[PDB]
Each structure stands twice: as structure tokens, then as C-alpha cells.
């Protein structure tokens, strides 16, 4: 049977092709994860259908209902068989779903509009003229919410109460906000995305400072899935074969416009 | 009852305390992995005994013998219950043992004696005056032996047939070889070790070029071990709390000698 793959529209991982309207099924999309999905399906020998997560979220647990949303939720509730996307491996998620060994290593980073007086997280936490936030329902927000280290704790105190909200529904929303904020907004996102955007027109943003942490993205499957073991070994094989590095260069810098 | 931990004497992961002779059991050792072992044990709730792998190797399968050596072997044959060391997560190993999500991210790198006319792997591959090799029975050697990309394949072709042998039994042996060869030997080792040595007197070595690949170290347990699940969650928990980053700073830079 065809494996239902849940993913998210997030460049350069998954994007609709220029001529998607005249295309069908998986042919409508392109990106790092689209290529990854094809490679995995081939090595594990299965047919699949790419589907875009309904609520457009990565995955967080509602504190009140305890119900998971996003791709994590689609896996938890059996709406999808596997998630192939820039989904971060975290403790709370690992408790409800399975992750393969990472196919990409990254960390939380700072995105600024070129020229803003900020070079590090400590710099952001020591000022108020420049607002900053993170994506909603994700691992980055959880990071600051659950951080006991001085700098990040203070940043969270400011962000969780900030009015208007400094949080955004999608990476694209955060990037747009930085660009149109005349430098009065900094966005906290994973280095992978920061580095990608930094290489795209109008080439008006840049990553500053070192990453705040070190983690990875993993292919996720529901607990007790029969694809879990194989997919995990497939990821390792692809990394060692050099495919993952090949794909990283293909979608990040070979297509860079800055 | 008491969990037997296999590890390896590799600075700054595990080292004998100056006064180990007058100490007992686990107190005889110090290092990044010693600190990590204590934390993993505390969080998983078990007592443990640190033991140094008999053959001083990380782990590889003998071609014809088909027997696994090193720490991997101690786990495969039931001599140890868990391995806590800078053991690389690889496909061939994950096929016989379990690995937690990575506790450290790294990649193969190049170590040169300062002043050596080498800036990358391509540079090494295009010349012959400077010999270069890797560690034995490990993931680095296997990386080159299996590589299908031009540059690395060329490097392997040279290394495998070079005489005298360009390979070494221990990291320390490779570092000394670099330090004593007057720039005529470059050593290929993981970035973590390269970065550490670069901060050690006589401060005569340096890491050059970008990493050749991207992977990580994981805590290993025998396949089907009852400790696997908890250890994995412990690693994620500890990484998210910043312990891992704190530990690397403690053993790498806080104690830097350069
Ligand atoms: Zn392939
Ligand atoms: Zn609610
Ligand atoms: Zn602890």
C-alpha cells in the first residue's frame, strides 16, 4: 500500500513547482525533502503520496487538551505514515513518535536585516528597541520556553509577554517581518533556513552570531511503525553515500541568488 | 545489577587522573565521557562500572574473521552493557548495535603541522610530498574505503597502498606523527579531536579546510537492550538543558593551553 507522507511547504525543503497547476500527485512539488523522499522510497522499496500537513505546523502539544497538532499530530493520530520534513528531533516529540538518526545538523540562529546593531543573543536581550520572536508550535519556541540559562530565559520573559505578538505562523512570515521592519525586528530560526534565506534576493538579511544550540532533523514515524527501522538505516546510508551533502548543495547554494 | 560501561582512553573524553594509582573504581578516570557517564547513570537510575576496552579500538568487523573488535565488539558479544565514548554512529555499526540520538556533532577533518602547504582534501589528493593517513579500525578509515566521490577515492587509493603504513593505532600516535614529521604528514581525524589538539601545547597543529562529512557520536547499547530507550531520552534531555555544550566548553576551551 501507498505510504502517506506528511510534509510542510517550507522552502527549499518542499515547494510547488513553477508549473504545478499542470502537474499531478508528487510531481507538483520539488525541494530537498521531495528528493529525500524519492531516495528513501527507492531504498526501502515503497510507493508514496506526498501530502501537505493540514494546519501548516511542525508540531506542538496543546497544554490544555494535550492534543498534538502539525505533522507530529498527523503521525500520532494515524493520519500519516511518515513525516519527511525539516522536523526537529526533540525530547517531547521522541516521547510520542520515532525519529531516524538526523539527516541534517543545525541550531537556532539569529536573522537580522542587514545593518541592524545586533551580533548575538546577548545583544538582543540587552535592548528593547529591536523586537524579536520565533515560529509558533515548534521546537524553537519550546527551546526558549524551557531554557534556564540566563540570556535565553530573559529573552523568553520578553517574548512570551511581548505585545503585539512577536511570534509568527510560518518561517515566511518571520522573514517578511524582518525585511519590512526597517531593522526593528530580528527573527530566531534554525541556521539551515537562515543560511538559505541569506542566499536569496533581495539579499537583505544575514545570519549573525553562532548557533544557540546543536541538534538535528529526523524522519519521523509513528510509534511501533514497521518502516521505522528501515528508514533509519536508509538515512545513514544516504549520508555516508554523500547524497545528503549533494542535496544540501543543490538546493542551498547552487540555486543561491546572492 | 551494575552496568558495565566500555569506553576508551582518548583525551579529553577519558583519561587517567594524575593520582589514579591512589584512587578506586570510577574515581580513577576523568573527562568529558566520564562526566557524561555519571549524568546518564543518574538520569536512567543505574549504578555503573567504567572499563577501558581491551584492544583499545573503537570498532570494526574483520573481513574474513567477521568478528567485531573494539567497543562495538564488547557490546556485540555481551562483554559490556553500554559504550560511552566518542563512538561514531555509522550504518555498519547500527546494523549490529543500537545508538542513542547523537550527543556530539562532528565531521572528518585535516590536521596539519603549522606551516604545511595544505588547505583541503583536494590539496592532499593532488600532491605526493606530504603523506597522510587515518586511525585504524574506525569510521574514518571506512569512510575513505567506501567513498565514491573523486577526491576521497583518490585519497583512499593512495593511503591503502602507501608504504610504510600511513595508518595509526591511536589518535595520539597520529598527532605525534604530525608533530614530528616536519610538515610531511597530515592526519585525517574527526573535527572534535582536531579542535581539542589545536588547543594543546606545543600549539603546533591546526585544523584546515571544512569538514569532509557530517555525522555524530552516540551512546551505544547491545541490540535489544532494556537501557536503550532511557539512555536515548536522557541524551536528548541533557542536550536540551545545555549540559552537553557545557561539557564541551569545560574539556575543550576552559582548559585550553594555547
Ligand atoms: Zn540512492
Ligand atoms: Zn487549547
Ligand atoms: Zn543531571
Swiss-Prot record, chains A, B:
Post-translational modification: Palmitoylated. Depalmitoylated upon L-glutamate stimulation. Ubiquitinated by RNF167, leading to its degradation.
Extracellular side stretches: 117-258
Disulfide bridge map: 203-258
Cellular compartments annotated: Cell membrane; Postsynaptic cell membrane; Postsynaptic density membrane
Expressing tissues: Detected in forebrain. Detected in dendrites of neuronal cells. Expressed in the pyramidal cell layers of CA1 and CA3 and in the granule cell layer of the dentate gyrus.
Record-annotated site: Crucial to convey clamshell closure to channel opening: 118
Induction, per UniProt: Down-regulated in the pyramidal cell layer of CA1 in the hippocampus by global ischemia.
Binding site for L-glutamate: 86, 88, 93, 139-140, 190
Site (Interaction with the cone snail toxin Con-ikot-ikot) location in chain: 61, 145, 237
Recorded domain comment: The M4 transmembrane segment mediates tetramerization and is required for cell surface expression.
Similarity remark: Belongs to the glutamate-gated ion channel (TC 1.A.10.1) family. GRIA2 subfamily.
Note: The postsynaptic actions of L-glutamate are mediated by a variety of receptors that are named according to their selective agonists. This receptor binds AMPA (quisqualate) > L-glutamate > kainate.
Name the UniProt record assigns to this protein: Glutamate receptor 2
Gene: Gria2
Residues of the full protein shown: 414 to 794 of 883
Amino acid at each position: 500500500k501507498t505510504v502517506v507522507v506528511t510534509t510542510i511547504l517550507e522552502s527549499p525543503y518542499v515547494m510547488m513547482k513553477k508549473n504545478h497547476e499542470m502537474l499531478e500527485g508528487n510531481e507538483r512539488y520539488e525541494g530537498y525533502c521531495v528528493d529525500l523522499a524519492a531516495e528513501i522510497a527507492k531504498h526501502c522499496g515503497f510507493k508514496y503520496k506526498l501530502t501537505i500537513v493540514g494546519d501548516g505546523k511542525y508540531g506542538a502539544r496543546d497544554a490544555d487538551t494535550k492534543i498534538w497538532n502539525g505533522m507530529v499530530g498527523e503521525l500520532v493520530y494515524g493520519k500519516a505514515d511518515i513525516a519527511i520534513a525539516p522536523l526537529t528531533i526533540t525530547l517531547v516529540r521522541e516521547e510520542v513518535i520515532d525519529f531516524s538518526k538526523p539527516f541534517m545538523s543545525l541550531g537556532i540562529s539569529i536573522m537580522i536585516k542587514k545593518g541592524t546593531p545586533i551580533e548575538s543573543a546577548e545583544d538582543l536581550s540587552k535592548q528593547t528597541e529591536i523586537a524579536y520572536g520565533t515560529l509558533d508550535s515548534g521546537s524553537t519556541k519550546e527551546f526558549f520556553r524551557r531554557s534556564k540559562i540566563a540570556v535565553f530565559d530573559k529573552m523568553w520573559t520578553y517574548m512570551r509577554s511581548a505585545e503585539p505578538s512577536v511570534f509568527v505562523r510560518t518561517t515566511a512570515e518571520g522573514v517578511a517581518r524582518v525585511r519590512k521592519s526597517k531593522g526593528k525586528y530580528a527573527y530566531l530560526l534554525e541556521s539551515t533556513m537562515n543560511e538559505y534565506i541569506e542566499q536569496r534576493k533581495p539579499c537583505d538579511t544575514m545570519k549573525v552570531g553562532g548557533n544557540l544550540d546543536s541538534k538535528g532533523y529526523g524522519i519521523a514515524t509513528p510509534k511501533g511503525s514497521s518502516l521505522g527501522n528501515a528508514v533509519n538505516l536508509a538515512v545513514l546510508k544516504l549520508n555516508e553515500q554523500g547524497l545528503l551533502d549533494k542535496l544540501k548543495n543543490k538546493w542551498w547554494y547552487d540555486k543561491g541568488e546572492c
